[PDB]
């Protein structure tokens, strides 16, 4: 809203209106200062913000009624049968069919636990995910991991 307001003008025209005056809407005479041009420029600004969303700087917007009104004419049913607040939620609904309820409802996050590979038990993974390894000396880490001739030995 601030970005659109700064460039071409206030969008909530009549937000500060009194007696029908102090209006900030475009002129009724279709021209270089009229509704078509103003809406085109607002469209450009929202398109810029959508490009930001696509590039990932901004969070993905939730599903809207206007957007829901198209939805292939068939995805509306999936969204309705699911909670489907976000496109990510709809994607999960489709891509984890075993997570759902019965009737098509969506099951929340706190009970979907993905498998954790055993490859995370490697020594270098432990060192990377431990926040004190950089401050632990070589001898300390050596005795911490292995207490045998394999690791006994500057260093």
């Amino acid at each position: 809203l601030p970005l659109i307001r700064r460039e071409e003008g206030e969008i909530a025209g009549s937000l500060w209106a009194m007696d029908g005056g102090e209006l900030s809407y475009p002129k009724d005479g279709g021209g270089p200062q009229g509704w078509g041009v103003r809406l085109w420029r607002e469209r450009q600004l929202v398109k810029r913000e959508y490009q930001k969303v696509l590039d990932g700087y901004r969070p993905v917007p939730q599903l809207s009624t206007l957007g829901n009104s198209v939805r292939t004419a068939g995805d509306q049913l999936d969204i309705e049968r699911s909670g489907a607040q976000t496109p990510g939620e709809l994607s999960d609904y489709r891509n984890f069919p075993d997570n759902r309820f019965d009737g098509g409802q969506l099951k929340p996050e706190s009970e979907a636990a993905p498998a954790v590979p055993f490859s995370a038990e490697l020594v270098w993974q432990g060192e990377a995910n431990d926040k004190l390894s950089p401050y632990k000396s070589d001898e300390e880490i050596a005795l911490e991991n292995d207490n045998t001739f394999f690791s006994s030995l500057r260093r």
Binding site: L132, Y135, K136
Partner: protein, 93 residues
């Protein structure tokens, strides 16, 4: 963890290191006060850590508090708006 790792190494604990710990705790208290003004439980937790350091660790390691130690502690008290205690510390220093 670094602190207990040092006392495990058995090194000679240094006034700069104790001052770094005190600065960490005092800055945590100040920064929690200014950013998350609620949760007085956490505020008092950080403050208790800082006070425990300032009041026991220096005599535990037999170190004498110095300019930097008073600087950090006075910064904490000043942020807490404890004008009388901070000013008393200043003129006692």
């Amino acid at each position: 963890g670094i602190y207990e790792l040092v006392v495990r190494r058995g090194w000679v604990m240094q006034l700069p290191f104790v001052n770094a710990l005190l600065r960490l705790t005092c800055q945590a208290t100040i920064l929690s006060m200014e950013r998350t003004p609620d949760e007085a439980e956490t505020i008092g937790r950080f403050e208790e850590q800082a006070n425990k350091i300032w009041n026991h660790t220096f005599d535990e390691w037999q170190l004498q508090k110095d300019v930097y130690s008073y600087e950090c502690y006075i910064a904490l008290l000043a942020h807490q708006q404890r004008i009388d205690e901070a000013e008393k510390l200043f003129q006692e220093m």
